[PDB]
Write a structure and sequence with these properties.
seven-stranded mixed β-sheet, alpha/beta, 3 chains, Carboxyl-terminal protease (chain A), protease (chain A), elongated, five-stranded antiparallel β-sheet, part of a larger assembly
C-alpha cells in the first residue's frame, strides 16, 4: 500500500526520453529493487531461469577468481592456487575495475563471474586496482580448466607434524585429507593451511570438520523465519578426535574456509593462526516468483557454534601474525662456555628454508610444539 | 488494479523469505531508487538531502562555513578560505588541520560527514577546533563564483573561467566582457565543468552567435522537437574565442562547445569530452524530494549527436608543463598549463589572420 | 605531452547509457605540433569568413 511507486511509474511512462512498456518498467523495478536490497541478489527472467546450468556454453572454463564486494566495489576475495589468474599475478583484495572493456562501477558479483567464464582456450582482459600501485594493472589471462589437486599433504622435516594444504573446498577435500592422514599414521599434529582459500561447497566444510569434532553443532543456518533454520551437527564418526591441529587463515579465507575454522575454534578443537578473514557467511536461494520467473536473494546467514555471525565480521584468529620472513639466522659472534678459557669439557617435505620465509607457518609449528608439551605434561 | 502484479509478487517473496525483516517503506524506496537508476545513466531519485544539494548547485549558494576542504595530508585540512566568508573574516588559514568541528573529532569521519556538520542554515552558530586554536563563527550564505574573468598578463587577451552552469553564467560573462572593452580575444575555459542549466548553455552561446540553431531536442516522435535558434541580438559576433574542454566537460559545457564548433565561431582545444548527450529534467514529487528523468536527446547545430562520443576538439594537447631552456594570469601560470598556452597561441594566430584581412 | 595518463570515466562506459610526416614525427617535435595547430586555427578562421 505505497502509492509513490505508481506516481513514479506514471511520470516515467510519459516523461522519459523513450517510450517503454509497463513490462519494461516492472522488470527494471524488480531488477532495481534487488540491486539495492542485496549484493548477492539477481533477477532471473524466463530464459535465465530455464538456463541455470550454463552461460549458453558447453565448454566451461574460467579464471579462478572469487569475486565479492567490500568498500562498495568489486574486490577479489582470493585467486585459487594454481589457476591462470593466480599465475598471472592477480592478488587478493584487488578491486576489479574493468572486464575486457566493460566497467564494473555498478555491476553485481553475479554479472562479473559470467563475464569471466568462457571457453577454456580463449583470452580475457581484466583491469584491477591495487593499493600501493600508481596506475590500474591490466592483466591478459587465458582461461583454462580450473581442476587441480585442491589438497596435498607434506611432512615437515625433523618434526612429527605434517602440513595439510587445502586450496579450496572443491568436492574432493574430505577424502583427500582423510587419505593423507591415513597415509601418515605416525604423525602427532596438523598444520591445516586455509590461507587464500575462498571457500566452496558446504558439504566439504561440514565433512572436513567431522574428521576432528566428535560432538556438537558445527554450523547453523538462520534467517528471518524461525522455522526452516538448520543446524549441522557432527557425527559420532570422528576419528582424529585428539590430534593437535593448528589452522592458518588470512584475508583470503572465506565461506567454507571460515566455517571449518570457526567451528574448530569455537569447540576449542584447534588454534587459529594468521589474520582476520574476509567474512563471507550467507546462503542465497532461488525463489520462483512469477510465471517461470525467479529471484535470487539471501535467505539465511551462517552462525557459528558460539552463535557468532560470519558475515560482516569473519574469524578473528587466536594468534595474529602478519606475513614476513623469520628475523635472524643468528647475528652474534657471542661468547659461550664452549669457547671459553679452561672450560670443563662435555661429559616431498617442508624444509626449514620454507618455514624461514613464513612466520605464519613457523607460528603454526611452534603452536604444535606447545600442544605436544602440554600433552606430555597431562599424560604424566 | 492488477497491473504491477509482477513487481508486487517479488515484494511479497522478499517480505516472506528475505534474511532480514525490512519494511515496505524501506522496500519501496529501494525499488524507486532502483528503478530510476536502472532506466538511464543519469536519471535518479533525489532524497531530501540531494534535492537541496541540486538546488545549491543551481543558485550558486549553500550557506556553509566558507572553506574549501579536503583530506590532504591524510587529515581534514583547510585548502583555502573564501574571500568575504566567516572563516576568512575570523582568520582560519590554509593548511590548518581541522581537529574537531563542534565537539566531535574529525579523524574517523569522512569528508561527506564534515560537510554535513559544517554546512547549515545561515546565522547559525558553529565552532571548529583546528591546529589548538578554537574559532567561533556564525554560518552565512556563501556565493560560489560560477564565472570569473581576468586579463592575461602582457597580452591583449582575456581569460574567462566558467566552473559550472549556474543561474548567473550568462550575466557574469556578459558583465565581465563589458568590464574589459579593449580585449582582442577570450579563452573560454570549460574544463572539468560538469554542465548545468540548459537555459544558460543556450544563453551563453547566443551571446556569441548571431544566426542559426544552437541546439535541438527530440523526445517524442519529432513534433514537439524543440529547437533553440539565436535571437540575433548577439553583441560579440567577431571576437576571437578559444574554448578549453577536457574529459570533465559534460552536458551544458558540450552544448556551448559544440555550438561554437559547428558554427566555426570558436576553436575547441583540449581533449575529447565526457560525452553526455541527454537533457535531464527534475519534477518535484514530495514537498522536499524530486525525481530526475532523462527527458530528451540534444543535437548540435549540424544535427550530429554527441551521445557516448563526446566532442573531438580541433586541437588535442593533453595537460603538461611547457618546455623551456636557455588578479591576472601571469606567465608562471601559463608555463604550468600547456593547454592554456595552446589556447592563447590559437588566439595569436587568429589575431594575425584577421590583420591579413585588414590590408590593401 | 603524453598521449594520456588516465583511465578516466566517460558516459560511453556508464551503466544503462544511451548509445611521410607521421604522428611519430610530430609527437617528438612540440615545435612542429604548434605549427600544425596554428594552421588548424587559421583554416577555421578563414572558413568562418565565408
Amino acid at each position: 500500500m505505497f502509492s509513490r511507486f505508481s506516481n513514479v511509474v506514471s511520470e516515467i511512462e510519459k516523461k522519459y526520453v523513450d517510450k517503454i512498456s509497463i513490462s519494461e518498467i516492472m522488470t527494471k523495478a524488480i531488477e532495481g529493487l534487488l540491486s539495492n536490497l542485496d549484493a548477492h541478489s539477481a533477477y532471473l527472467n524466463e530464459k535465465k531461469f530455464k538456463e541455470f546450468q550454463a552461460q549458453t556454453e558447453g565448454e566451461f572454463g574460467g579464471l579462478g577468481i572469487t569475486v565479492g564486494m567490500r568498500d562498495g566495489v568489486l574486490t577479489v576475495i582470493a585467486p585459487l592456487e594454481g589457476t591462470p589468474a593466480y599465475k598471472a599475478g592477480v592478488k587478493s583484495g584487488d578491486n576489479i575495475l574493468k572486464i575486457n572493456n566493460e566497467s564494473t562501477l555498478s555491476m553485481s558479483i553475479d554479472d562479473a563471474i559470467n563475464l569471466m567464464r568462457g571457453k577454456p582456450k580463449t583470452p580475457i582482459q581484466i583491469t584491477i586496482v591495487r593499493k600501493n600501485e600508481p596506475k590500474p594493472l591490466v592483466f591478459n589471462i587465458i582461461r583454462d580448466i580450473i581442476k587441480l589437486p585442491s589438497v596435498y599433504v607434506k611432512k615437515i622435516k625433523e618434526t612429527p607434524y605434517l602440513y595439510v594444504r587445502v586450496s579450496g573446498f572443491d568436492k574432493n577435500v574430505t577424502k583427500s585429507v582423510l587419505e593423507g592422514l591415513k597415509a601418515n599414521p605416525k604423525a602427532k599434529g596438523i598444520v591445516l593451511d586455509l590461507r587464500g582459500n575462498p571457500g566452496g561447497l558446504l558439504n566439504q566444510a561440514v565433512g572436513l570438520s567431522n574428521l576432528f569434532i566428535k560432538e556438537g553443532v558445527l554450523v547453523s543456518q538462520k534467517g528471518k523465519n524461525k522455522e526452516e533454520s538448520l543446524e549441522y551437527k557432527a557425527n559420532g564418526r570422528a576419528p582424529y578426535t585428539n590430534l593437535p591441529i593448528a589452522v592458518l587463515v588470512n584475508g583470503g579465507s572465506a565461506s567454507a574456509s571460515e566455517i571449518v575454522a570457526g567451528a574448530l575454534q569455537d569447540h576449542k578443537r584447534a588454534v587459529i593462526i594468521g589474520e582476520k578473514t574476509f567474512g563471507k557467511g550467507s546462503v542465497q536461494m532461488l525463489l520462483p516468483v512469477n510465471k517461470d520467473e525467479a529471484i535470487k536473494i539471501t535467505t539465511a546467514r551462517y552462525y557459528l557454534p558460539s552463535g557468532r555471525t560470519i558475515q560482516a565480521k569473519g574469524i578473528t584468529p587466536d594468534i595474529v601474525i602478519y606475513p614476513g620472513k623469520v628475523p635472524e639466522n643468528e647475528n652474534k659472534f657471542s661468547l659461550k662456555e664452549a669457547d671459553l678459557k679452561h672450560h670443563l669439557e662435555q661429559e616431498k617435505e617442508v624444509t626449514p628454508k620454507m618455514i624461514n620465509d613464513d612466520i605464519q607457518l613457523k607460528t603454526a609449528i611452534d603452536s604444535l610444539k606447545t600442544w605436544s608439551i602440554v600433552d606430555e605434561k597431562m599424560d604424566e
